[PDB]
């Protein structure tokens, strides 16, 4: 299943995201097992906080931590966990957590998939209130797990997102 | 996954439907990718309109357009996207859209799966209000996508549904 | 999919459960098809009654009836149907139904997956009201299906749960 | 609020129902307080069972037990708790419980409010599966409360419903 | 209840809206009864179509048709039916229906109530896709009721909204 | 409506709570207007955080800030906004915010209303994970509103809750 989905139709700018956690879903952290082809319950989020936007990963990528490249996808209605969405990048949130460096991309679907998000061209177009909510979420969601923490370094734009994607694709192929 | 599900236990009258879109779900059009084994987001429906009944397809069939045979399944509670339901036919809605001829079957589950729908023997037993809603849905849901349109030709009964199924099974095997 | 998930990381006490029916979901009985890798609609529950806790099975086990070992998993929020949860046993409900002996385990997730349930050490820690609801559910949910019935024999503890799991693993390997 | 709503525009056949419990709502029994004008939590249902159809009462009536006349209203989507619906009668369920005789009417909205239910002319038109679910609900929902019980005597038709309504209106005026 | 809520703290620009229909709620048209103080079920929408944004009215106003001034309020999450929201105007949709002229205002909450909508200053700031959905909704939702119809004339801005509000307040006082 | 509900049947230990915000509801802060008898939208919570338990107030009380006494009510399913629940106290959370001292009670329903919570006798019986979530919620929910802040001082028990209630009742009567 998950293992055979292409990273994208035209990398890095035209990529695929497998959804693990729908926006506003009850506070349960699922992670795709690429060796089982199934979503696995990683943990019940200690704080009870919910992802403000959809969360998933790009298949066939391997990030700095040995996990696939992480992606937040903004949509007008939550997406189904375990579904695939063709997406494009807006930018990224840079952070470090208990396991070291942690960048997450911020994306929207392809314009023909989601006309509603077509006018979001870069991270600067995302409403400030949403940006602020995403940043608060990552700063606070691990507050009640011993040994876990997050510091947000800052936002970066589309070119940085594309580097992260090209690196991830390369690293995965070895 | 999807590719290996049989078209049915006793074709054409006793067939399987893989669900893509639960009745009344938020207005997001998923399509099964039979080569990925996963549901893929085709588009956010432009009008925000919702399927009035469950929508899916018969696996191992190939309709006139090169897609599997499409099915609307009526149930007392929505079905899970990506699940399989053993079904029987009531009839069909005949239409033409921007890509040519487009028939969709109307079905209910097998009587032992859904005793609640056992008294629906043919399309004529479906409440007129539901029939009318389904027809309005197909007439209007594509209203806000350029280049897309639908004209409803009319309803047909169980024998026409069975032909569509037998043709689809034959065509798929080449 | 389902067929390749291990029964557990350290049997019998540390096992995996694939979820078929989320706690409080609409009254539709799904069963995993291990040969299709998909959830299948077994039936619309005749009484309209809902599982009071999550329901699923241990993969790679084979119980007395030729089905995998059944498990009720208690969580603070319902789990996703078709997901996998690492679990530990609390005890079991002993019953006989129309097809003979029927034991179901009662479990919670691993403590690092669900800290919220860490203080449930055995079946005796489960609130009496929940115990009573589970027992009423099994006594009544089949009331409206001809030829189906259930008598509850009683509760048993962790050691009995572990026997059921070890037997199931052994039986599956032939 | 509740106290000033008329029992109906043309009694007994054209009456009003104030909704206390939406069909399929979580298992919490609300009762309108006509002296507070507010819904009050009577109890968490011990069995966790849910009303299969909407439940409420006719204002300005006084039944045999000193409570207003009780009504089950069938609709295609649940109604809002605390809302008012213009309705007509289909029949009634006769029962006795721990507090003596207990009849409940079965109704649908006025035809111009709910065209979808226009073809239900009497209790005999209600699907058998729904009838059976309603009867099971009342037989079982109090199973886990000490001192509470219900025996179902049987169904009766529109004329009996109308008597119950005329009596209730008369009794309320003293 | 409803009858005593002020039309606004500083008319016409700072006004109150009582919500009758939450955005995306199941397709049931409630109307506030100002003489009962309660929401009343007007009808089950024939097409099954849902309001794309919250819908309600300004209390203590009387529009051209003898009903209070109608308002669509855009929010990031649906509002509770029967609740009150302090709002400001963006513009209006002009229409005529079976009962003659029908203008509906488009509004957002006060900036301190909803910071998320602060950057919407006029109707021109509303995304085109949302504008298009609202217009499609009114063009189509009455399609299945005999004797009912709607033609959309066009959009107008904040000053026209304010006139409609001042007229409504004046007309209500006689 | 709200203004005429008694503070309780036997104060301070047997009191009434009017619910403003159901546990886990979308992140919108409603406040009862006792002069309108209606729920009013105070604000969209800036952080998007949700109340982990039901939130409301005791009618006919007047706390140190000039608002009624605030109460968190723990239940197995969320309660309806605007409903009334007979409750008993477990303890209280002591805090100071931007407007000075701020104590909130923690309660459960009367034992006959909610048998499921009967074994919670005091604040010390509440699971630590829930206690921790409630405290995190109040520490963080106002993070994104300028001029607003909260420091948690600590927990206190049933006797302190009862003082707060007796003071509130006295203060309200002048
Ligand atoms: K490229
Ligand atoms: K055949
Ligand atoms: K072991
Ligand atoms: K009459
Ligand atoms: K003014
Ligand atoms: K006392
Ligand atoms: Na990362
Ligand atoms: Na991380
Ligand atoms: Na087709
Ligand atoms: Na088509
Ligand atoms: Na079993
Ligand atoms: Na069984
Ligand atoms: Na009665
Ligand atoms: Na009764
Ligand atoms: Na109007
Ligand atoms: Na109109
Ligand atoms: Na306070
Ligand atoms: Na405060």
Residue numbers in the entry:
A (entry chain A), B (entry chain A), C (entry chain A), D (entry chain A), E (entry chain A), F (entry chain A): 2 to 175
Task: Quote what the paper states about this structure.
SSGCID has solved the high-resolution X-ray crystal structure of inorganic pyrophosphatase from the pathogenic bacterium Burkholderia pseudomallei, and a subsequent FOL screen of this target identified several fragments that specifically bind at multiple oligomerization pockets in a molecular interface between the two trimers of the homohexamer.
The bacterial enzyme inorganic pyrophosphatase may serve as an example for this approach, since it exists in a hexameric state that requires conformational flexibility for its essential role in converting inorganic pyrophosphate into phosphate. Moreover, whereas all bacterial inorganic pyrophosphatases function as a homohexamer, the eukaryotic cytosolic and mitochondrial inorganic pyrophosphatases function as homodimers. Hence eukaryotic inorganic pyrophosphatases have different oligomeric interfaces than those of bacterial enzymes. This suggests that it may be possible to inhibit the bacterial inorganic pyrophosphatase safely by targeting its oligomeric state rather than its highly conserved active site.
